[PDB]
């Protein structure tokens, strides 16, 4: 009855939540004409 043993201690662990989501610009606004009229060019 001999066995490899790894004694347990307190091992700090900095791994944490991995959770996703969509990505977006900042730096991703729009363009709204503030002046009505024809599109010339």
């Amino acid at each position: 009855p001999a066995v490899g043993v790894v004694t347990v201690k307190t091992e700090p662990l900095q791994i944490t939540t991995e959770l996703p989501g969509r990505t977006s610009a900042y730096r991703i606004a729009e363009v709204r004409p503030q002046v009505s009229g024809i599109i010339l060019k």
């Binding site: 969509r22 990505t23 610009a25 991703i28």
Partner: protein, 53 residues
């Protein structure tokens, strides 16, 4: 070395009478297509292509 030469093969299973020019790539990831789009301006004087296909 240049941008951009796009080809075509239309629903007939044949390539469009000629190729077309890729204008650009708008890098915005389309939310619900999750997909980049490429707008390639093509000459269509032969009145063959139609808006949308």
């Amino acid at each position: 070395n240049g941008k951009a030469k796009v080809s075509l093969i239309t629903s007939d299973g044949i390539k469009f009478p000629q190729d077309g020019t890729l204008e650009f790539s708008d890098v915005t990831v389309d939310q619900t297509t999750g997909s980049i789009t490429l707008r390639a301006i093509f000459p269509n004087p032969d009145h063959t292509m139609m808006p949308g296909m």
